[PDB]
């Protein structure tokens, strides 16, 4: 029951990465889009990655066109869009992006089947179905672009955030969890 | 937090019934349709009503056109359809039917807002959205025609069944619950 059963192809199509490569690391899975209202979170995700990389955080981005069709581009067009359009201004992610694919429905990526079903969903509301480009609909489906899952260094899911939760709050929660683990380790030895 | 905050108009349009009239009774809420694959459950519901009426069971039926559009008729056409078409054969329900209305979405009947949110939903699967004629979609939505809720004699919800659970199994569960309550009453007095 770990993420190490799975892997994904990098966005340039050149390398399949088994998630076992992230053994010993905290992994933050984020489904992404280039034309979302939350696409500015890319800037904050870069900052989070740079700040917490020393403590074992790895961010992985999964482009998905299932939420308002907000990732229309081919895989080769995604990095250019981020750099020159939105966020634009020369932006380049400092974390790994993978090929575009489904996160919900019959053709969803299997590691997302695992992740989605490991934690309760992020809201009671699925939303209006016209905006949700998949079938069938299920209680634990990802609700929108930029939903987030934290997986621990043992490959086991820890927690899941609503897409609109700020990246600062996500950071604060990761740090708190890492501190609790450190403290709980020290305390177990004294005991 | 009881069903006694609500009521509904009978299918003939002649009487509004406050659910407080069912104080002291077990109430089984069933959303119904005339052209459903489960419409034959009407025959079993009649039998359940006749068998458990002496022990305080009341069945209430709420026609709804939101599931495959399987209740197209006007209110005055529903009883004739049941009697002459499906189930047909002269069938007449022996329990009260109310006016057609919504059970999910923005215009859902308020007592169903209460009921749906009182118990977990009946399956992980909502289904394919083309068959579900409401918006927005929510985790606790009724899944199909013939979902069922039991409310106790104090007006508080007890349990909820999947639509495909057989009426014999529903009966067995009601009876078991009523027996447990009787036994738990006797046992509390001895104690
Ligand atoms: Cl977005
Ligand atoms: Cl049905
Ligand atoms: Na849809
Ligand atoms: Na629909």
Curated annotation (Swiss-Prot), chains A, B:
Tissue spec: Secreted in plasma.
Domain of life from the UniProt record: Eukaryota
Catalytic residues as annotated in Swiss-Prot or TrEMBL: 36
Residues spanning the membrane: none
Record bears the keyword Secreted: yes
GO CC field: extracellular exosome; extracellular region; extracellular space
EC number: 1.11.1.9
Keywords: Oxidoreductase, Peroxidase, Secreted, Selenocysteine, Signal
Post-translational modification: The N-terminus is blocked.
Cellular compartments annotated: Secreted
Chief place where the protein resides: secreted
Catalysis: reaction(s): 2 glutathione + H2O2 = glutathione disulfide + 2 H2O; tert-butyl hydroperoxide + 2 glutathione = tert-butanol + glutathione disulfide + H2O
Gene Ontology molecular function, alphabetical: glutathione peroxidase activity; identical protein binding; selenium binding
GO terms of biological process kind: hydrogen peroxide catabolic process; response to lipid hydroperoxide
Free-text function comment from the UniProt entry: Protects cells and enzymes from oxidative damage, by catalyzing the reduction of hydrogen peroxide, lipid peroxides and organic hydroperoxide, by glutathione.
Quaternary data: Homotetramer.
Family stated for the protein in its record: Belongs to the glutathione peroxidase family.
Protein name: Glutathione peroxidase 3
Gene giving rise to this polypeptide: GPX3
